[PDB]
Every structure is written in C-alpha cells, then in structure tokens.
A = this chain, B = another copy of it.
C-alpha cells in the first residue's frame, strides 16, 4: 500500500521538514506507507506555487501538505477547491470557509481578545505584521468599537531592514504622544 502525497516546503523550513521526517518515522505502519514528494519553492511566489501544485497533481497525489503566504493562499484554496484536492497546512487559518483545506493552526483571535479583557485594557498599541493577514487586526479594531478601546494600530511590517532604526525611533515617538505603556506584538517569531 503506497500512498503518494505532496510536500510544499518553503526554502528555510528546516525544523519544519525535520519534524515532518520524524513524523513519517513515528507514524509508519506495515498496513501502508506514505510517499512524500518534496518541492522546495518560494512560498510567496504565486506562480511557483501554481506549478508545484499542478506538478504534484500530475504525479497523481492523494493529498498535499504545505504552506502558503498572504499572497499565495488564494491560489491554494482555489485550486484545491476546484480539483477537490485536500491540502493540509500549519500556516495561518483561512479568512473564511474554504473546502478541501485542513488547517493545523488554531484561531488565536479569540484567545487574544479574551486576554485583553482579563488585564482590563482600554488603551493599547497594536503593532502588527501583514504577513499572516489582517484577520486579527480587524478583530481588535471591530472589538474596539464595542468594548470601546483606543487602539493605536501600526504596520511594523513594511519597515525596510537595511536602515530600520530611524523608523523604530520614530515609531516609539508616536507611542509616546499618548504615553503608550501597553503594546501588543502581532508578528512572527
């Protein structure tokens, strides 16, 4: 019993792939074996992702495990929905109800909003990164209307890294006009 599956790992996902390998070993049985076809492509590039998908599809896979970015996510959700191909991903949850997509990452939106009320915050700064979608940003903004919060949302993402210092100094300069002492960092590791 040989079940061929696809593997879309973004270049740099070393520990992710290492964990992917360990899983293959820990969950290997005699009843059937999984045959991973690994494709290391720039997850951000929508075009490349399209090829890697059609390539793994022509190879005749039963399911696909990979990752997507805020840019290529629409490509995956669309193709997998049209071709009825299942796509398992640890990446951020899709903003909606897209069939044929299995998401390993639980929604943090709920846990965050609950924590804010616990500490009883009414005025805080929200530094966000547009990498995982503004799904959580909209969450805090919409709740800011109901719970009546004074949120200071600032996109800390588009900061060019080859001179990113006069930007941070000018960042906490605005976070001092209102003497912001409570900051929420919505970013990657």
Contacts and interface: CB of A to CB of B under 8 A. Distances in A.
A168 interface: no
Contact of A146 (B83, B134, B150, B174): B174
A79 interface: yes
Interface of A: 45-48, 50, 71-72, 74-75, 77-79, 81-83, 130, 134, 137-138, 141-142, 144-146, 148, 150, 152-155, 174-175, 177-178
B141 A145 contact: no
A72 B72 CA distance: 9
A107 to B, nearest CB: 15
Given A74-B72, A175-B145, A81 B47 contact: yes
Given A74-B75, A78-B45, A79-B46, A145 B152 contact: yes
B153 A82 contact: no
Given A46-B74, A145-B175, A146-B174, 12 more contacts: A46-B77, A46-B79, A47-B78, A47-B79, A50-B75, A50-B78, A71-B74, A75-B75, A141-B155, A145-B174, A148-B178, A150-B150
A177 B150 contact: no
A153 B79 CA distance: 33
Nearest to A148: B177
A174 B145 CA distance: 6
